[PDB]
């Protein structure tokens, strides 16, 4: 019933643009929305986010997260490792590449979501969520070598999966950070399960 | 180590603005970013809420109540947690219970409320509280629940069993063009992984 009539460019930056979207509401009344898009997309999705499950025998299973200064937020954020998909890169390949660059871990693909939306009332941005396991007992993951590209400055934080939500809440209390909504949602469901 | 140096307005709409952000990198080098922000944030601890609504009924499996709506930024239908912006002076909890009733008809009971969490922190400063609400589906109030959508809100309610959430989302995505929200997907994935 609903659909886009037209899109007017408001402002285009290098990396982001702002549009005025004209759409038909279900009643046949025309309405407008203000919408954000990235200028970088081709591709399945703008990006990937990796859920990295670090598995070491005789240890609690951990979820590997990253902490970074985020200029839009004006502060530090705790997130899944993540980046944009290169032109002609598959989402699986982007996940393994970003996971290594940001954490130094080398992982295996467990599963890969369809394109999911980041903030659909605001932007068209989408990602694929990629669950990856990291055999933490392999030699290649003994001393994880992170390969940060230009301007990336990433701290790695591994938290136990079985208490993820209490651990995150504790970092927020102590360290003045913003947890990512996807990280939080995952953590919540771990507790809400069963 | 890192901090904001300046925020230069590039373009302001009615609802969203684009900024040129200048920040200090941890090597002591000045860099720039492009940042999205809403124009509607006041003294709220976040822009918005999203509601995790757990529908509970005797002799039923627990459902997660979701909503499907057309999203002009995406140009299509999206399946999401019930959500909306927090009104000036309104608490995140009150906003959650109000949005849940408006969008689904249900009258919930607060269970938990997250700290403010970031929606897409490499892009925007937008934040929400994730509010877990239980719905007593045996209460007569929640028997024949009628949405009270505000002007231009057009919302369908989709209740799915918690114990099969990911597969049930996959089956909806198999049957039409629709995008699942990344927070919904993260939550469904954790329900599987636990
Ligand atoms: C980025 C956008 N957000 C909204 C929105 O959700 N609004 C609901 C209350 C005021 C505006 C647009 C109408 S455009
Ligand atoms: C909204 C923005 N996103 C990025 C980003 O993550 N980029 C990674 C490759 C292209 C730029 C900015 C540098 S500004
Ligand atoms: Cl797993
Ligand atoms: Mg990244
Ligand atoms: Mg990276
Ligand atoms: Mg809403
Ligand atoms: Mg609403």
Short mmCIF file of C-alpha atoms and ligand atoms in Angstrom, two decimals:
data_model
loop_
_atom_site.label_atom_id
_atom_site.label_comp_id
_atom_site.label_asym_id
_atom_site.label_seq_id
_atom_site.Cartn_x
_atom_site.Cartn_y
_atom_site.Cartn_z
CA UNK A 1 0.00 0.00 0.00
CA UNK A 2 2.83 2.50 0.82
CA UNK A 3 5.67 3.58 -1.44
CA UNK A 4 8.16 6.22 -2.34
CA UNK A 5 7.07 8.88 -4.84
CA UNK A 6 10.37 10.85 -5.01
CA UNK A 7 13.58 11.80 -3.18
CA UNK A 8 14.98 15.31 -3.11
CA UNK A 9 18.64 15.82 -2.23
CA UNK A 10 19.03 18.31 0.68
CA UNK A 11 22.80 18.08 1.23
CA UNK A 12 25.48 15.60 0.14
CA UNK A 13 28.70 15.32 2.02
CA UNK A 14 31.61 13.07 1.29
CA UNK A 15 30.27 10.13 3.33
CA UNK A 16 26.60 10.96 4.15
CA UNK A 17 23.70 12.68 2.41
CA UNK A 18 20.38 14.06 3.64
CA UNK A 19 17.25 13.68 1.52
CA UNK A 20 13.64 14.71 1.58
CA UNK A 21 11.51 11.69 0.85
CA UNK A 22 8.05 12.00 -0.56
CA UNK A 23 5.81 8.91 0.05
CA UNK A 24 2.20 7.78 -0.22
CA UNK A 25 0.59 6.92 3.09
CA UNK A 26 -1.88 4.01 3.18
CA UNK A 27 -4.88 6.38 2.87
CA UNK A 28 -3.71 8.01 -0.46
CA UNK A 29 -2.33 11.17 1.29
CA UNK A 30 1.16 12.29 0.24
CA UNK A 31 3.65 12.92 3.14
CA UNK A 32 7.30 13.76 3.58
CA UNK A 33 10.15 12.29 5.61
CA UNK A 34 13.75 13.36 6.18
CA UNK A 35 16.12 10.53 5.45
CA UNK A 36 19.88 9.91 5.85
CA UNK A 37 21.86 7.73 3.43
CA UNK A 38 25.56 6.78 3.06
CA UNK A 39 27.21 7.77 -0.24
CA UNK A 40 29.51 4.69 -0.08
CA UNK A 41 27.09 1.83 -0.89
CA UNK A 42 27.01 -0.24 -4.16
CA UNK A 43 26.22 -4.55 -2.45
CA UNK A 44 24.07 -6.55 -0.04
CA UNK A 45 24.41 -3.87 2.68
CA UNK A 46 26.50 -0.93 3.78
CA UNK A 47 28.37 -2.94 6.44
CA UNK A 48 28.95 -5.97 8.61
CA UNK A 49 28.90 -6.42 12.32
CA UNK A 50 30.61 -9.49 13.71
CA UNK A 51 29.49 -11.46 16.75
CA UNK A 52 32.80 -13.12 17.76
CA UNK A 53 32.48 -16.06 20.08
CA UNK A 54 35.92 -16.74 21.60
CA UNK A 55 36.18 -20.36 22.62
CA UNK A 56 39.07 -21.56 24.84
CA UNK A 57 38.92 -24.86 26.57
CA UNK A 58 38.54 -24.64 30.36
CA UNK A 59 37.47 -20.96 30.05
CA UNK A 60 34.20 -19.26 29.84
CA UNK A 61 33.11 -18.56 26.32
CA UNK A 62 33.58 -14.83 25.60
CA UNK A 63 32.10 -12.34 23.23
CA UNK A 64 34.79 -10.15 21.75
CA UNK A 65 33.89 -6.44 21.63
CA UNK A 66 35.68 -3.26 20.66
CA UNK A 67 35.90 0.14 22.29
CA UNK A 68 36.48 3.26 20.09
CA UNK A 69 36.04 6.99 20.14
CA UNK A 70 33.03 7.76 17.91
CA UNK A 71 32.94 11.36 16.64
CA UNK A 72 29.16 11.44 16.11
CA UNK A 73 28.71 10.41 19.73
CA UNK A 74 31.44 12.71 21.17
CA UNK A 75 32.68 9.78 23.24
CA UNK A 76 33.72 6.15 23.52
CA UNK A 77 31.38 3.30 22.53
CA UNK A 78 31.44 -0.44 23.06
CA UNK A 79 30.46 -2.35 19.93
CA UNK A 80 30.71 -5.55 17.93
CA UNK A 81 33.60 -5.36 15.53
CA UNK A 82 32.40 -3.83 12.34
CA UNK A 83 33.08 -2.01 9.12
CA UNK A 84 31.87 -1.29 5.63
CA UNK A 85 31.85 -3.95 2.93
CA UNK A 86 34.46 -3.29 0.16
CA UNK A 87 33.11 -3.16 -3.46
CA UNK A 88 33.01 -6.81 -4.62
CA UNK A 89 33.62 -8.27 -1.14
CA UNK A 90 31.09 -10.80 0.20
CA UNK A 91 29.65 -10.15 3.69
CA UNK A 92 31.38 -13.26 5.10
CA UNK A 93 34.73 -12.10 3.81
CA UNK A 94 34.23 -8.60 5.17
CA UNK A 95 33.49 -10.06 8.63
CA UNK A 96 36.66 -12.12 8.77
CA UNK A 97 38.66 -9.21 7.47
CA UNK A 98 37.19 -6.67 9.92
CA UNK A 99 37.47 -9.07 12.84
CA UNK A 100 41.20 -9.54 12.13
CA UNK A 101 41.96 -5.85 11.56
CA UNK A 102 40.10 -4.72 14.68
CA UNK A 103 40.88 -7.64 17.09
CA UNK A 104 43.65 -9.66 15.44
CA UNK A 105 41.57 -12.83 15.87
CA UNK A 106 41.13 -15.29 12.98
CA UNK A 107 37.73 -16.85 13.05
CA UNK A 108 35.37 -19.15 11.24
CA UNK A 109 31.92 -18.29 9.92
CA UNK A 110 29.08 -19.85 11.86
CA UNK A 111 26.09 -18.08 10.23
CA UNK A 112 25.24 -14.80 8.37
CA UNK A 113 22.07 -12.78 8.59
CA UNK A 114 20.19 -11.17 5.74
CA UNK A 115 20.60 -7.43 5.39
CA UNK A 116 19.15 -5.88 8.59
CA UNK A 117 18.37 -2.22 9.21
CA UNK A 118 20.32 0.01 11.61
CA UNK A 119 17.85 2.80 12.34
CA UNK A 120 15.04 2.60 9.74
CA UNK A 121 13.16 5.75 10.92
CA UNK A 122 16.27 7.77 10.21
CA UNK A 123 18.50 6.11 7.63
CA UNK A 124 18.63 3.43 4.95
CA UNK A 125 21.74 1.91 6.55
CA UNK A 126 21.96 -1.82 6.66
CA UNK A 127 24.39 -4.45 7.79
CA UNK A 128 24.83 -8.16 7.79
CA UNK A 129 25.22 -9.69 11.28
CA UNK A 130 27.88 -12.44 11.09
CA UNK A 131 28.38 -14.90 13.91
CA UNK A 132 31.96 -16.13 13.94
CA UNK A 133 33.67 -18.55 16.31
CA UNK A 134 37.33 -18.05 17.27
CA UNK A 135 39.25 -21.13 18.26
CA UNK A 136 41.16 -19.42 20.99
CA UNK A 137 43.43 -22.48 21.52
CA UNK A 138 44.98 -22.27 17.99
CA UNK A 139 48.45 -20.89 17.62
CA UNK A 140 47.25 -18.16 15.25
CA UNK A 141 44.95 -16.73 18.03
CA UNK A 142 47.60 -17.03 20.79
CA UNK A 143 48.97 -13.51 20.29
CA UNK A 144 46.21 -11.77 18.34
CA UNK A 145 47.90 -9.26 15.99
CA UNK A 146 45.38 -6.36 15.24
CA UNK A 147 45.88 -4.67 11.82
CA UNK A 148 44.24 -1.21 12.30
CA UNK A 149 43.92 0.74 9.01
CA UNK A 150 44.47 4.51 8.85
CA UNK A 151 42.72 6.52 11.61
CA UNK A 152 41.26 3.46 13.43
CA UNK A 153 42.11 3.18 17.12
CA UNK A 154 40.46 0.14 18.61
CA UNK A 155 40.61 -1.39 22.13
CA UNK A 156 39.55 -5.05 22.42
CA UNK A 157 37.33 -6.11 25.34
CA UNK A 158 36.38 -9.74 25.82
CA UNK A 159 33.51 -10.41 28.12
CA UNK A 160 32.03 -13.65 29.24
CA UNK A 161 28.93 -14.66 27.24
CA UNK A 162 27.14 -16.16 30.30
CA UNK A 163 27.10 -12.74 32.23
CA UNK A 164 27.37 -10.35 29.29
CA UNK A 165 24.63 -7.97 30.32
CA UNK A 166 25.89 -7.50 33.99
CA UNK A 167 29.45 -7.03 32.63
CA UNK A 168 28.35 -4.33 30.20
CA UNK A 169 26.21 -2.56 32.83
CA UNK A 170 29.36 -2.60 35.02
CA UNK A 171 31.52 -0.95 32.32
CA UNK A 172 28.88 1.72 31.83
CA UNK A 173 28.79 2.44 35.61
CA UNK A 174 32.56 2.66 35.98
CA UNK A 175 34.04 3.91 32.73
CA UNK A 176 31.47 6.40 31.16
CA UNK A 177 30.81 4.68 27.83
CA UNK A 178 27.84 4.06 25.54
CA UNK A 179 27.04 0.46 24.77
CA UNK A 180 25.79 -0.25 21.29
CA UNK A 181 22.10 -1.07 20.88
CA UNK A 182 22.81 -4.31 19.05
CA UNK A 183 25.37 -5.41 21.70
CA UNK A 184 22.77 -4.56 24.36
CA UNK A 185 19.92 -6.35 22.64
CA UNK A 186 22.08 -9.51 22.28
CA UNK A 187 23.06 -9.31 25.93
CA UNK A 188 19.44 -8.91 27.03
CA UNK A 189 18.24 -11.93 25.05
CA UNK A 190 21.04 -14.11 26.58
CA UNK A 191 19.44 -13.34 29.95
CA UNK A 192 15.83 -13.54 28.73
CA UNK A 193 16.32 -16.99 27.07
CA UNK A 194 14.69 -20.07 28.63
CA UNK B 1 42.78 10.48 24.70
CA UNK B 2 40.32 11.54 21.93
CA UNK B 3 37.90 14.45 22.01
CA UNK B 4 35.72 16.75 19.91
CA UNK B 5 37.26 20.03 18.74
CA UNK B 6 34.34 21.47 16.89
CA UNK B 7 31.00 20.69 15.34
CA UNK B 8 30.23 22.70 12.17
CA UNK B 9 26.68 22.68 10.92
CA UNK B 10 26.54 21.57 7.24
CA UNK B 11 22.72 21.36 6.82
CA UNK B 12 19.64 21.50 9.12
CA UNK B 13 16.24 20.06 8.24
CA UNK B 14 13.13 20.04 10.38
CA UNK B 15 14.08 16.68 11.97
CA UNK B 16 17.72 15.83 11.11
CA UNK B 17 20.95 17.81 10.69
CA UNK B 18 24.38 16.92 9.20
CA UNK B 19 27.55 18.20 10.92
CA UNK B 20 31.26 18.38 10.07
CA UNK B 21 32.95 17.10 13.21
CA UNK B 22 36.53 17.94 14.05
CA UNK B 23 38.21 15.76 16.61
CA UNK B 24 41.61 14.98 18.14
CA UNK B 25 43.01 11.52 17.33
CA UNK B 26 45.03 9.55 19.85
CA UNK B 27 48.36 10.31 18.00
CA UNK B 28 47.57 14.03 18.63
CA UNK B 29 46.46 14.63 15.00
CA UNK B 30 43.31 16.73 14.19
CA UNK B 31 40.81 14.72 11.95
CA UNK B 32 37.25 15.18 10.58
CA UNK B 33 34.06 13.15 10.48
CA UNK B 34 30.56 13.68 9.17
CA UNK B 35 27.94 13.27 11.88
CA UNK B 36 24.19 12.94 11.83
CA UNK B 37 22.03 14.22 14.62
CA UNK B 38 18.33 14.75 15.28
CA UNK B 39 16.98 18.29 15.86
CA UNK B 40 14.42 17.08 18.39
CA UNK B 41 16.58 16.05 21.40
CA UNK B 42 16.05 18.19 24.50
CA UNK B 43 17.21 17.31 28.06
CA UNK B 44 16.21 13.63 27.52
CA UNK B 45 18.70 11.00 28.32
CA UNK B 46 18.07 9.72 24.80
CA UNK B 47 16.23 10.42 21.60
CA UNK B 48 13.96 7.45 21.85
CA UNK B 49 12.88 4.18 23.32
CA UNK B 50 12.48 0.73 21.84
CA UNK B 51 10.30 -1.72 23.73
CA UNK B 52 11.00 -5.42 24.20
CA UNK B 53 7.48 -6.60 24.95
CA UNK B 54 7.10 -10.10 26.34
CA UNK B 55 3.58 -11.29 25.99
CA UNK B 56 2.75 -13.77 28.79
CA UNK B 57 -0.42 -15.88 28.90
CA UNK B 58 -1.22 -18.96 30.88
CA UNK B 59 -0.79 -22.16 28.78
CA UNK B 60 0.91 -20.24 25.93
CA UNK B 61 4.49 -19.91 24.95
CA UNK B 62 5.80 -16.37 25.62
CA UNK B 63 5.63 -14.11 22.54
CA UNK B 64 7.82 -11.18 21.58
CA UNK B 65 5.50 -8.49 20.20
CA UNK B 66 6.88 -6.78 17.08
CA UNK B 67 5.58 -4.21 14.65
CA UNK B 68 5.75 -3.89 10.89
CA UNK B 69 5.58 -0.40 9.32
CA UNK B 70 6.60 1.38 6.17
CA UNK B 71 9.84 3.24 6.68
CA UNK B 72 10.46 6.03 4.19
CA UNK B 73 14.31 5.99 4.72
CA UNK B 74 14.37 2.35 3.73
CA UNK B 75 11.68 2.59 0.95
CA UNK B 76 9.92 -0.52 2.25
CA UNK B 77 8.47 -2.37 5.22
CA UNK B 78 10.51 -3.15 8.35
CA UNK B 79 9.87 -5.41 11.30
CA UNK B 80 10.97 -3.73 14.62
CA UNK B 81 10.52 -3.52 18.36
CA UNK B 82 7.73 -0.99 19.14
CA UNK B 83 9.49 2.37 19.43
CA UNK B 84 9.18 6.12 19.44
CA UNK B 85 10.80 9.33 20.48
CA UNK B 86 10.69 10.40 24.18
CA UNK B 87 8.48 13.52 24.63
CA UNK B 88 10.01 16.52 26.47
CA UNK B 89 9.82 15.80 30.24
CA UNK B 90 8.59 12.25 29.71
CA UNK B 91 10.49 9.41 31.41
CA UNK B 92 11.94 6.56 29.18
CA UNK B 93 9.68 4.09 31.04
CA UNK B 94 6.56 6.18 30.50
CA UNK B 95 7.52 6.68 26.85
CA UNK B 96 7.95 2.88 26.44
CA UNK B 97 4.56 2.02 27.94
CA UNK B 98 2.91 4.83 25.98
CA UNK B 99 4.47 3.80 22.64
CA UNK B 100 3.66 0.10 23.29
CA UNK B 101 0.03 0.96 23.89
CA UNK B 102 -0.17 3.33 20.90
CA UNK B 103 1.42 0.92 18.46
CA UNK B 104 0.06 -2.45 19.72
CA UNK B 105 -2.81 -1.81 22.04
CA UNK B 106 -1.16 -3.64 24.87
CA UNK B 107 -0.79 -2.33 28.36
CA UNK B 108 2.48 -3.51 29.72
CA UNK B 109 4.32 -3.59 33.04
CA UNK B 110 7.87 -2.31 33.30
CA UNK B 111 10.59 -4.98 33.88
CA UNK B 112 13.86 -3.23 33.12
CA UNK B 113 15.25 -0.18 31.46
CA UNK B 114 18.66 0.06 29.85
CA UNK B 115 21.03 3.02 30.01
CA UNK B 116 21.09 5.09 26.83
CA UNK B 117 22.54 2.97 23.97
CA UNK B 118 23.74 4.10 20.57
CA UNK B 119 21.90 3.37 17.41
CA UNK B 120 24.72 3.62 14.84
CA UNK B 121 27.57 5.40 16.49
CA UNK B 122 29.86 5.71 13.40
CA UNK B 123 27.03 7.66 11.74
CA UNK B 124 24.86 9.45 14.27
CA UNK B 125 24.59 10.50 17.89
CA UNK B 126 21.13 8.89 18.15
CA UNK B 127 20.39 7.03 21.29
CA UNK B 128 17.60 4.98 22.89
CA UNK B 129 16.66 3.28 26.08
CA UNK B 130 15.80 -0.35 25.52
CA UNK B 131 12.84 -1.01 27.85
CA UNK B 132 11.78 -4.57 28.66
CA UNK B 133 8.10 -4.77 29.42
CA UNK B 134 5.98 -7.80 30.29
CA UNK B 135 2.42 -7.92 29.03
CA UNK B 136 -0.08 -9.89 31.16
CA UNK B 137 -2.03 -11.34 28.32
CA UNK B 138 -4.54 -12.93 30.75
CA UNK B 139 -5.73 -9.44 31.83
CA UNK B 140 -9.04 -8.35 30.21
CA UNK B 141 -7.32 -5.01 29.30
CA UNK B 142 -5.08 -6.98 26.93
CA UNK B 143 -7.78 -9.27 25.50
CA UNK B 144 -8.84 -7.45 22.34
CA UNK B 145 -6.04 -4.82 22.25
CA UNK B 146 -6.79 -1.83 19.97
CA UNK B 147 -3.87 0.30 18.64
CA UNK B 148 -4.09 4.12 19.12
CA UNK B 149 -1.78 5.22 16.30
CA UNK B 150 -1.06 8.98 16.13
CA UNK B 151 -1.38 10.96 12.90
CA UNK B 152 0.49 9.26 9.99
CA UNK B 153 1.34 6.15 12.09
CA UNK B 154 0.37 2.93 10.34
CA UNK B 155 1.46 -0.10 12.31
CA UNK B 156 0.81 -3.86 12.06
CA UNK B 157 1.40 -6.06 15.11
CA UNK B 158 3.25 -9.33 14.75
CA UNK B 159 3.54 -11.55 17.79
CA UNK B 160 6.07 -14.39 17.56
CA UNK B 161 7.17 -17.09 19.99
CA UNK B 162 10.23 -16.35 21.84
CA UNK B 163 11.29 -19.99 21.64
CA UNK B 164 11.39 -19.87 17.83
CA UNK B 165 11.98 -16.21 17.15
CA UNK B 166 14.86 -16.35 14.67
CA UNK B 167 13.22 -19.07 12.50
CA UNK B 168 9.96 -17.26 12.49
CA UNK B 169 11.61 -14.01 11.39
CA UNK B 170 13.45 -15.96 8.64
CA UNK B 171 10.09 -17.31 7.44
CA UNK B 172 8.57 -13.83 7.25
CA UNK B 173 11.57 -12.53 5.29
CA UNK B 174 11.27 -15.60 2.96
CA UNK B 175 7.61 -14.59 2.17
CA UNK B 176 7.87 -10.89 1.13
CA UNK B 177 10.35 -8.01 0.75
CA UNK B 178 10.76 -6.75 4.28
CA UNK B 179 13.76 -5.93 6.38
CA UNK B 180 14.24 -7.13 9.93
CA UNK B 181 15.70 -4.60 12.31
CA UNK B 182 19.22 -5.22 13.55
CA UNK B 183 18.25 -5.04 17.19
CA UNK B 184 15.40 -7.55 16.68
CA UNK B 185 17.82 -9.78 14.79
CA UNK B 186 20.53 -9.50 17.51
CA UNK B 187 17.96 -10.44 20.13
CA UNK B 188 16.63 -13.41 18.11
CA UNK B 189 20.25 -14.61 17.44
CA UNK B 190 21.08 -14.50 21.21
CA UNK B 191 17.88 -16.49 21.99
CA UNK B 192 19.28 -19.14 19.57
CA UNK B 193 22.87 -18.97 20.95
CA UNK B 194 21.79 -19.36 24.57
C1 LIG C 1 14.49 11.36 10.92
C2 LIG C 1 13.08 11.54 11.12
N1 LIG C 1 12.47 11.19 12.21
C3 LIG C 1 11.12 11.52 12.12
C4 LIG C 1 10.28 11.10 13.24
O1 LIG C 1 10.38 9.92 13.62
N2 LIG C 1 9.50 12.00 13.94
C5 LIG C 1 8.46 11.56 14.90
C6 LIG C 1 8.29 12.77 15.84
C7 LIG C 1 8.90 13.98 15.12
C8 LIG C 1 9.51 13.47 13.81
C9 LIG C 1 10.74 12.14 10.95
C10 LIG C 1 9.41 12.62 10.56
S1 LIG C 1 12.09 12.30 9.91
C1 LIG C 2 29.36 8.80 8.48
C2 LIG C 2 30.73 8.42 8.32
N1 LIG C 2 31.10 7.18 8.16
C3 LIG C 2 32.51 7.17 8.01
C4 LIG C 2 33.16 5.84 7.80
O1 LIG C 2 32.90 4.92 8.62
N2 LIG C 2 34.00 5.60 6.69
C5 LIG C 2 34.69 4.30 6.48
C6 LIG C 2 35.10 4.29 4.98
C7 LIG C 2 34.49 5.59 4.36
C8 LIG C 2 34.35 6.53 5.57
C9 LIG C 2 33.13 8.39 8.07
C10 LIG C 2 34.56 8.72 7.98
S1 LIG C 2 32.01 9.64 8.31
CL1 LIG C 3 27.86 -19.69 18.32
MG1 LIG C 4 35.05 -0.69 12.60
MG1 LIG C 5 37.89 -1.92 10.57
MG1 LIG C 6 7.22 4.04 16.29
MG1 LIG C 7 4.49 5.71 17.84
#
